[PDB]
Design a protein around this nucleic acid. Structure first.
Ligand SMILES: [Mg+2]
Ligand SMILES: [Mg+2]
Ligand SMILES: [Mg+2]
Ligand SMILES: [Mg+2]
Ligand SMILES: [Mg+2]
Ligand SMILES: [Mg+2]
Ligand SMILES: [Mg+2]
Ligand SMILES: [Mg+2]
Ligand SMILES: [Mg+2]
Ligand SMILES: [Mg+2]
Ligand SMILES: [Mg+2]
Ligand SMILES: [Mg+2]
Ligand SMILES: [Mg+2]
Ligand SMILES: [Mg+2]
Ligand SMILES: [Mg+2]
Ligand SMILES: [Mg+2]
Ligand SMILES: [Mg+2]
Ligand SMILES: [Mg+2]
Lengths: 169, 157, 208, 68, 294
RNA sequence: ACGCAGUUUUAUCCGGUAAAGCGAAUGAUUAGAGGUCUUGGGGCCGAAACGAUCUCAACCUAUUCUCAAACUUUAAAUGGGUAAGAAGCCCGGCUCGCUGGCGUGGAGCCGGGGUGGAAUGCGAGUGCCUAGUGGGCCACUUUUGGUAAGCAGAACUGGC
RNA sequence: CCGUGGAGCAGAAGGGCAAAAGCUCGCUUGAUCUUGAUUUUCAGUACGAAUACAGACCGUGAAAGCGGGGCCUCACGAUC
RNA sequence: GUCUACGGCCAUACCACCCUGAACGCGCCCGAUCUCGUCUGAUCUCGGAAGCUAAGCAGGGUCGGGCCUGGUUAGUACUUGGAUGGGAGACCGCCUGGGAAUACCGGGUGCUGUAGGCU
């Protein structure tokens, strides 16, 4: 059949967005250290609304990206607590789906009384071999039409691989 | 009272043409400019380093000095009373060759070739130009087709 | 208010309302279509036109008064919901006024007399249509009389002409009933869309 | 006492009375504004020319005179 | 629902240059690399262009011209099997050899192969070819990096080292060659010559053979096919250098060609397009006619 | 014949006015037709419900009426500069401390050979001294302020 | 994901800019010395501003190159 | 008849969709020990060659959208010079010369400079 149309997870991005900066944000950074085995990166204050206590140039959220077998393992750990029920509204038109979970105690982490209670967003992006064209510098080119992931293809791949159930939104 | 300035009133003169913005084409740089050649001046808005004054836009002059990134041109600027031969140092981004000198060189080459070729044959060729002479008496042809009659159309709103 | 005698000719360049006026009184006209706007193109066959013969300026108040007169005569001639009038001319030139000494010689005579905007007029060229009315095939004399009544209210000299076109469209009346039968013109409310041949084949497959 | 501000009326006549003739074009116009390095090189080439000119050019002139 | 790009967008859209659209150039570094000062009226500006593609490395030397960049000489990687390097046509040692071959070929074409022999004994240090009095001056040429990011240890710099050892006077610095430490500003030529002679790949092959045989079977398949052990690469490049310096000239390939076939489809003419349109118009009404009468 | 021209002819560029356009960018702008993802206001099935339906406002699409001295795709006429030879071209040889793969490039100099190079008209070039003037006005046309003025203020040409 | 400039370039506007003149990062004061010529209002006088060079010392990148202030149009001052 | 590397013109060559690609080449692609850099070998860098034309890319097609060119608009709107021309004016006509653009329609859609590998 298709020679090299096998779908594959390009990366898995975890993101923890807290309200205020300080000790809680530092702890939300420490939790990702043991969750992903790598140092996260801080994102801060794209704007200034002041309606809930943020300003310009203030550390707000932490995030990171995992690729490869570790990304697949983290996605499996997330779908474990998710129990493999995804809604129809979780999938985007491009083929990327995210679910989000509750506080990270259900992932299999030893609870620490000093860290606190934080969750993550757990956004997943799907890909195919050949999507690295739009990322290189020597020559840039669009993906195309028959190669880009569709809407139904993502949920079909999810049902085929992880045997999850798709609920109507 | 008219707010004299260096770039006053060039809103459409120093602007780039439509659908021609971006970086400068590289062909205008590789052109050769020697001393004594007749060139033209056209202000360009892509670069602002060595652009000439708004009064020399569209002026034709000969080159008297050449440097790394620019050329020196002697331009005949007509001041209120007389004409001054002014030396201007302008970069090569705003200068292009003048095809009038090229046409004159082609014509003089054709002339000195034609005379050198006709000297042996002894035919006094007329290589000197002239105005358009009045056309001679010619014979039109109707091939039996009657000339079509033309009538003015009545007025209609 | 100044009379219309002093704002008749075209003596200055167009001075429209923009970021440089920063102040202007509102216009007099607010509506341009007074008949039944939801009429189809096959409802009213003929159409008239008020074509100007003099290059001058027309005031928005004069346009308003003339269109009120035309509507008042038309709704009595052919009844309501049986016609469609349109004032094609739109006022955009803003005339300015220079109030003179608010009566004593204490204030300045002509020092800084650029003046403030007074109103809005409409510049009309020679041969430009002012108003146009479409009715049934038998309301020709009624449209002519309404346009004649509006002539007595418009300044200058403008004449009446019944165009050969079909309604408001740019197509003639003789080549309309045969070109609308087969798929070359599509009626869309008060207008007609002319479908060219240089399009994708799906637009042609959708028809026929 | 307001007066006239600025006009250019009756100026082209004053100019054309004397003439708007072009400047005097003469051979060897000037050497000002030319690159100083180029001017130095030209001076050196002009002052070192007579060193080798008066012999080799004379020999070549004798040769071409013998040729024709 | 939402506005998008339309006819008004396409009517105002201005396209970039062709060489820029696919991303082959930048027109910024070129504007400084190709343009010659007008004091040098017709003096060409020689630039060596090194491009590292997949399974190949192309090295040329060109100068400016109105019609197009005039190339004086060119060297490739697929010629190394002819000079003694059959496997590894995209290694750092391969870049060194192809730069040396380009330099030697240019010098032999210009007749200056005898003088300006360059650095014969490869040591990893800077050479800085200098001109000799009473003889034609050394070939002064510049470098063209292109789109590749200039990072310490690149194959473009390997080809640069090969050329400067072959005898091309090219201005450069020693901080971009492999072996330049980041903590200290000093440079070591021993590690540079070890990387030039292709010893890191030998260490990798030995490490794979010592740890995992499956890795040594998957990778270096062409190496084990050409039975080149890691201890032979120290001598194979030493021999290839001498072979290149002994026979730098490039032979002319056979011009014999075969007949050509219409492999690509041609454009249909206006008559054919109009006939296709007429057929599509005429065969559509019959479908609905049949569906109605049936 | 040197040379010159308030001019024309031939090549050659320069420009953004007149005009025109906005179913092309920006800013104003009247009305209709279809589709409704969503938002807000009404009516319907009925414990309420993105369970369903009619309509309006809003959005999108393809059209439609009228405008821009401080908008423009396109773009006139008039008009501005240059050239139409001997101060030019072909050939050979020297100098360079300029540049440089190269006797490469570019400038300067020397030497012999070859003027009839668009029309028309006219004799040109140049130095010194220097009085008066330094309140203007009017007219065809183009135009700024003003309702307008034998009003005030500009461009070319002519006149007092 | 679409996204030709619809953002930004210190500030009033115009022009200009997309592996950019925009944002970020790393070293840095060429925002330092010197003599001329030239452009702009022009009487072709000066000041201010600006252009292209040349002669020394430096910055930067590997390098071609750029830089003797701000992407350009204003942001400033004789005698004694 | 074609591609690669470097380029001139910079949409006749850009955008969306659909088909074909034999032998080289471009690439997708497999892996972080050395050179190198990020949260992530995704991107930039040293090691390839197990599969592929799925993608980029190259050709062809769309009564395709844009772009160029040619008719129509049109000797029409404008404009140099003239009149003791008309009209109360607004403006218009004539003589001598030049001459625009949108709607509408039709035709095309890459040509080449240097080095190289194939049928
Ligand atoms: Mg992008
Ligand atoms: Mg009264
Ligand atoms: Mg006075
Ligand atoms: Mg670069
Ligand atoms: Mg203007
Ligand atoms: Mg206009
Ligand atoms: Mg007075
Ligand atoms: Mg007056
Ligand atoms: Mg600005
Ligand atoms: Mg702009
Ligand atoms: Mg210097
Ligand atoms: Mg490191
Ligand atoms: Mg590392
Ligand atoms: Mg990888
Ligand atoms: Mg492919
Ligand atoms: Mg395919
Ligand atoms: Mg088409
Ligand atoms: Mg006239």
């Amino acid at each position: 059949e298709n020679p090299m149309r096998e779908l594959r997870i390009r990366k898995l991005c975890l993101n923890i967005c807290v309200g205020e900066s300080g000790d809680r944000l530092t702890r939300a950074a420490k939790v990702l250290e043991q969750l992903t085995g790598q140092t996260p990166v801080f994102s801060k204050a794209r704007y200034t609304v002041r309606s809930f206590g943020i300003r310009r140039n203030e550390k707000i959220a932490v995030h990171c990206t995992v690729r490869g077998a570790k990304a697949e393992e983290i996605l499996e750990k997330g779908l474990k607590v998710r129990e493999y029920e995804l809604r129809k509204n979780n999938f985007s038109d491009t083929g990327n789906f995210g679910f989000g979970i509750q506080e990270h105690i259900d992932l299999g982490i030893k609870y620490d009384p000093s860290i606190g209670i934080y969750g993550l967003d757990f956004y997943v992006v799907l890909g195919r071999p050949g999507f690295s064209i739009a990322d290189k510098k020597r020559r840039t080119g669009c993906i195309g039409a028959k190669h880009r992931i569709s809407k139904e293809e993502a949920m079909r791949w999810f049902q085929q691989k992880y045997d999850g159930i798709i609920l109507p939104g | 009272t008219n707010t004299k300035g260096k770039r006053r009133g060039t809103r459409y003169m120093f602007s780039r043409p439509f659908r021609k913005h971006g970086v400068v084409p590289l062909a205008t740089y590789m052109r050769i400019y020697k001393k004594g050649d007749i060139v033209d001046i056209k202000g360009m808005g892509t670069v602002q380093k060595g652009m000439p004054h708004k009064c020399y836009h569209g002026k034709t002059g000969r080159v008297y000095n050449v440097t790394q990134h620019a050329v020196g041109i002697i331009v005949n600027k007509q001041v209120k009373g007389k004409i001054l031969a002014k030396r201007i140092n302008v970069r090569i981004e705003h200068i292009k060759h003048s095809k009038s000198r090229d046409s004159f060189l082609k014509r003089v080459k054709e002339n000195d070739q034609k005379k050198k070729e006709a000297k042996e044959k002894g035919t006094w060729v007329q290589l000197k130009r002239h105005a358009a002479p009045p056309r001679e008496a010619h014979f039109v042809r109707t091939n039996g087709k009657e000339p079509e009659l033309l009538e003015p159309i009545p007025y209609e709103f | 208010r100044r009379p219309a005698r002093c704002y008749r000719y075209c003596k200055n360049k167009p001075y429209p309302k923009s970021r440089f006026c920063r102040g202007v009184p509102d216009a007099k006209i607010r509506i341009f279509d007074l008949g039944r706007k939801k009429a189809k193109v096959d409802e009213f066959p003929l159409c008239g036109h008020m074509v100007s013969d003099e290059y001058e300026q027309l005031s928005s108040e004069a346009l308003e008064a003339a269109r009120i007169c035309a509507n008042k005569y038309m709704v009595k001639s052919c009844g309501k919901d049986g016609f469609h009038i349109r004032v094609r001319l739109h006022p955009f030139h803003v005339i300015r006024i220079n109030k003179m000494l608010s009566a004593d010689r204490l204030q300045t005579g002509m020092r800084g007399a650029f003046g403030k905007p007074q109103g809005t007029v409409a510049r009309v060229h020679i041969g430009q249509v002012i108003m146009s009315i479409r009715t049934k095939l038998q309301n020709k004399e009624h449209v002519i009389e309404a346009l004649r009544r509006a002539k007595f209210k418009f300044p200058g000299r403008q004449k009446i002409h019944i165009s050969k076109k079909w309604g408001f469209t740019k197509f003639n009346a003789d080549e309309f009933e045969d070109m609308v039968a087969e798929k070359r013109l599509i009626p869309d409310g008060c207008g007609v869309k002319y479908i060219p041949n240089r399009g994708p084949l799906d637009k042609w497959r959708a028809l026929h | 006492a307001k007066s006239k501000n600025h006009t250019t009326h009756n100026q082209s006549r004053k100019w054309h009375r004397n003439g708007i003739k072009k400047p005097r074009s003469q051979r060897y116009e000037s050497l000002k504004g030319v690159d100083p390095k180029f001017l130095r090189n030209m001076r050196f080439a002009k002052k070192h020319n007579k060193k080798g000119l008066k012999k080799m050019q004379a020999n070549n002139a004798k040769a071409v005179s013998a040729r024709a | 629902v939402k506005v998008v790009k339309n006819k008004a967008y396409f009517k105002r859209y201005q396209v970039r240059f062709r060489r820029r659209r696919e991303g082959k150039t930048d027109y910024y570094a070129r504007k400084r690399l190709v343009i010659q000062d007008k004091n040098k009226y017709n003096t060409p500006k020689y630039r060596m262009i090194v491009r590292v593609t997949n399974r190949d490395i192309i090295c040329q030397i060109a100068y400016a011209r109105i019609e197009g960049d005039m190339i004086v000489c060119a060297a490739y990687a697929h010629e190394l099997p002819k000079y003694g390097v059959k496997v590894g046509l995209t290694n750092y040692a391969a870049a060194y050899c192809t730069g040396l071959l380009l330099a030697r070929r240019l010098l032999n074409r210009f007749g200056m192969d005898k003088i300006y022999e360059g650095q014969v004994e490869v040591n990893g240090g800077e050479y800085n070819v200098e001109s000799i009095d009473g003889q034609p001056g050394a070939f002064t040429c510049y470098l063209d990096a292109g789109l590749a990011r200039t990072t310490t240890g690149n194959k473009v710099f390997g080809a640069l080292k090969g050329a400067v050892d072959g005898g091309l006077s090219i201005p450069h610095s020693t901080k971009r060659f492999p072996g330049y430490d980041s903590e200290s500003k000093e440079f070591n030529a021993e590690v540079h010559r070890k990387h030039i002679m292709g010893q890191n790949v030998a260490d990798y092959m030995r490490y794979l053979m010592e740890e995992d045989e499956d890795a040594y079977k998957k990778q270096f398949s062409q190496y084990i096919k050409n039975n080149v052990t890691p201890d032979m690469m120290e001598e194979m490049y030493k021999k290839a250098h001498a072979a290149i310096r002994e026979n730098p000239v490039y032979e002319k390939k056979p011009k014999r060609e075969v007949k050509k076939k219409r492999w690509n489809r041609p454009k249909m003419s206006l008559a054919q397009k109009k006939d296709r349109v007429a057929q599509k118009k005429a065969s559509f009404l019959r479908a609905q006619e049949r569906a109605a009468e049936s």
